[PDB]
């Protein structure tokens, strides 16, 4: 939790930077906005690298991405 711990504390945030400002002039390891550089490689969701989930309501278990691709892993067993 403690972002500028073992320093003076938190002063403010730079949304152009996405890092907090400690009492010393050292950029902390926390984040202060979503608009900052996140090393992202693994994420949730399904129909990834495709057209996303087609928003129709289905009685059956057909889950089909908007490019026509059908993801049975996102679907269920029959």
């Amino acid at each position: 939790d403690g972002c500028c711990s073992k320093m003076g504390g938190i002063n403010y945030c730079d949304s152009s930077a996405g890092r907090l400002v400690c009492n010393n002039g050292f950029y902390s390891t926390c984040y202060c906005t979503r608009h900052a550089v996140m090393d992202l490689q693994f994420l949730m969701g399904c129909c990834l690298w495709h057209g996303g989930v087609y928003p129709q309501l289905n009685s059956s278990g057909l889950v089909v991405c908007n490019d026509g691709y059908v993801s049975e892993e996102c679907s269920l067993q029959k």
Binding site: A36, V37, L40
Partner: protein
């Protein structure tokens, strides 16, 4: 011209040059009637008007394939793109992914 009057386009002509909404996209002005989206993981903004994404950054997207690219006079790239849950961006020689929320 008779009853059928089929004026035959023997030569199609020029394909369209660029959609001109990209200029206001480049300046951050959303097109009229569009709606805001949520981008996380980096510094970019995005918009959705006609089931077609517009995105704005100064980075370079890789994966989902774009249709029109516009460049400012100082290094800002705007893209007329298809919709996507996520994008692949090479930031500084290192590859990251930026997720998009709002679809």
């Amino acid at each position: 011209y008779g009853p059928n009057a089929k004026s035959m386009p023997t030569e199609e002509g020029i394909p369209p040059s660029a959609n001109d909404l990209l200029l206001h996209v480049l300046e951050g002005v959303p097109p009229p009637g569009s709606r805001r989206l949520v981008v996380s993981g980096g510094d970019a903004r995005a918009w959705l008007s006609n089931e077609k994404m517009y995105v704005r950054t100064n980075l370079t997207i890789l994966s989902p394939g774009w249709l029109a690219s516009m460049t400012s006079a100082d290094g800002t790239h705007a893209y007329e793109m298809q919709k996507s849950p996520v994008l692949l961006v090479s930031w500084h020689g290192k590859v990251m992914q930026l997720k998009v929320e709002g679809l």
